[PDB]
Amino acid sequence: MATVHKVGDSTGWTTLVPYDYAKWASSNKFHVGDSLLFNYNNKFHNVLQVDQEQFKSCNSSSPAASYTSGADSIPLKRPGTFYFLCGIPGHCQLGQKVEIKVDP
Amino acid sequence: MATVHKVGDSTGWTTLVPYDYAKWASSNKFHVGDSLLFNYNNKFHNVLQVDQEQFKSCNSSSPAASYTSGADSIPLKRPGTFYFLCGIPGHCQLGQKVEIKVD
Amino acid sequence: MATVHKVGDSTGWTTLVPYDYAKWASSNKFHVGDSLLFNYNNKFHNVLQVDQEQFKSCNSSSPAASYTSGADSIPLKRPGTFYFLCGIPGHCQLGQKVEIKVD
Amino acid sequence: MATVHKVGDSTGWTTLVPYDYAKWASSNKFHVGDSLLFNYNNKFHNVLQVDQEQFKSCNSSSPAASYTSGADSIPLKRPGTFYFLCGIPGHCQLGQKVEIKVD
Ligand SMILES: [Cu+2]
Ligand SMILES: [Cu+2]
Ligand SMILES: [Cu+2]
Ligand SMILES: [Cu+2]
Numbered sequence: 001m002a003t004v005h006k007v008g009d010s011t012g013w014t015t016l017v018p019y020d021y022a023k024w025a026s027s028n029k030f031h032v033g034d035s036l037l038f039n040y041n042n043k044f045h046n047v048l049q050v051d052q053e054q055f056k057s058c059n060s061s062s063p064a065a066s067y068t069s070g071a072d073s074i075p076l077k078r079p080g081t082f083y084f085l086c087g088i089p090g091h092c093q094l095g096q097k098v099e100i101k102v103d104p
Numbered sequence: 105m106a107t108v109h110k111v112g113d114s115t116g117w118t119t120l121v122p123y124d125y126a127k128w129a130s131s132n133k134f135h136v137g138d139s140l141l142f143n144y145n146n147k148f149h150n151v152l153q154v155d156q157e158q159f160k161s162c163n164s165s166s167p168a169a170s171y172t173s174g175a176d177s178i179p180l181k182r183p184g185t186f187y188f189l190c191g192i193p194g195h196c197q198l199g200q201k202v203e204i205k206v207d
Numbered sequence: 208m209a210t211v212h213k214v215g216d217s218t219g220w221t222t223l224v225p226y227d228y229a230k231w232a233s234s235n236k237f238h239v240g241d242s243l244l245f246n247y248n249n250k251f252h253n254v255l256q257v258d259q260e261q262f263k264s265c266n267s268s269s270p271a272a273s274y275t276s277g278a279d280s281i282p283l284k285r286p287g288t289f290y291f292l293c294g295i296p297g298h299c300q301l302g303q304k305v306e307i308k309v310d
Numbered sequence: 311m312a313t314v315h316k317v318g319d320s321t322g323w324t325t326l327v328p329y330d331y332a333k334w335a336s337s338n339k340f341h342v343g344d345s346l347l348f349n350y351n352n353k354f355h356n357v358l359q360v361d362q363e364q365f366k367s368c369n370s371s372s373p374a375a376s377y378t379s380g381a382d383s384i385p386l387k388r389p390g391t392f393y394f395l396c397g398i399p400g401h402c403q404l405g406q407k408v409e410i411k412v413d
Binding site for chain 1: 152166167168169170171172173176177179181
């Protein structure tokens with residue numbers, strides 16, 4: 001059964017305090033058909049889908065997709081690794097980025 | 105016990121022509137385990153899940169969830185009533201909203 | 208085959224001077240598969256697709272589609288009447304709107 | 311006996327993964343009467359027809375035509391070379407551009 005994964009659990013998608021999104025991802029199992037739910041104050045953050053190179057360098061200049069609702073539901077349709085980060089200046093560097101492994 | 109319901113059938117989720125989404129919902133039977141499929145031009149529409157109050161007043165300010173893929177597959181995993189509307193300015197008022205009764 | 212119709216011909220999509228877009232449309236024959244090309248300075252205009260009611264009242268508050276490139280190519284894929292207007296305040300009232308009858 | 315060429319085949323027009331559009335173009339033959347089909351998520355990409363100069367420098371400021379349907383069917387009724395690129399910031403630089411030689 002498809003499952004909705006709330007990014008950061010009760011903490012959500014934020015930069016208010018440090019939060020290890022890599023550990024959040026590791027504590028979850030993502031399957032095709034699942035979705036990610038990003039909850040945040042859209043006056044301070046957004047969600048951008050990028051590739052591995054942009055993810056590692058925190059490059060938010062050329063996103064493959066962008067979400068700005070504050071309650072974005074993003075589908076995980078195929079097996080592989082997906083990368084998301086907040087594009088607001090300096091946020092990715094603060095650790096607001098997450099790698100999602102779908103059905104490895 | 106496992107059916108995919110195409111919202112608006114072949115017409116999809118749109119405002120180009122008047123479409124009775126209420127009649128579409130009433131012409132279908134939704135059961136837990138089923139899913140909804142919203143097909144639309146995602147540059148011009150979106151799908152927001154909201155509560156009863158927001159649904160009636162067409163308020164798209166604080167949605168519970170926002171879908172923007174243009175082919176959203178939304179699973180119905182619990183009995184009850186669910187509300188969806190398009191948050192693009194004025195689309196909800198034109199009738200692009202739908203109430204789903206599950207189980 | 209298909210044909211590209213340049214809206215307003217050499218005059219384009221503008222409000223600089225009065226231009227009868229209805230006459231332009233009547234002098235053209237639109238077929239399924241054809242496209243419309245709107246050329247304009249996008250700092251002053253845009254192109255919105257609306258329904259008949261909104262078209263008649265120059266209501267640009269809830270468009271079905273929006274284009275803002277200044278060189279928009281819009282496909283005409285089905286038989287029927289389509290309506291377009293510029294949504295910048297007062298432009299539709301100046302006559303910057305056009306009804307397209309496809310086949 | 312016209313032929314519809316689906317740009318990027320099943321992969322379509324995207325930047326999600328590196329895709330060699332140049333190889334795609336080279337592995338296909340385009341003749342007058344054919345058409346190109348660009349399939350993509352139109353909220354995140356577009357198709358702009360530009361000149362050789364703009365193509366090389368990935369300049370999308372003054373396109374000859376802008377397509378945004380997500381399933382653009384573009385007829386090729388003249389021999390020669392045509393240039394297309396995605397105007398979304400940085401996409402052209404990532405390689406989302408294609409040169410088409412007809413006849
Ligand atoms: Cu942020
Ligand atoms: Cu809508
Ligand atoms: Cu105007
Ligand atoms: Cu693009």
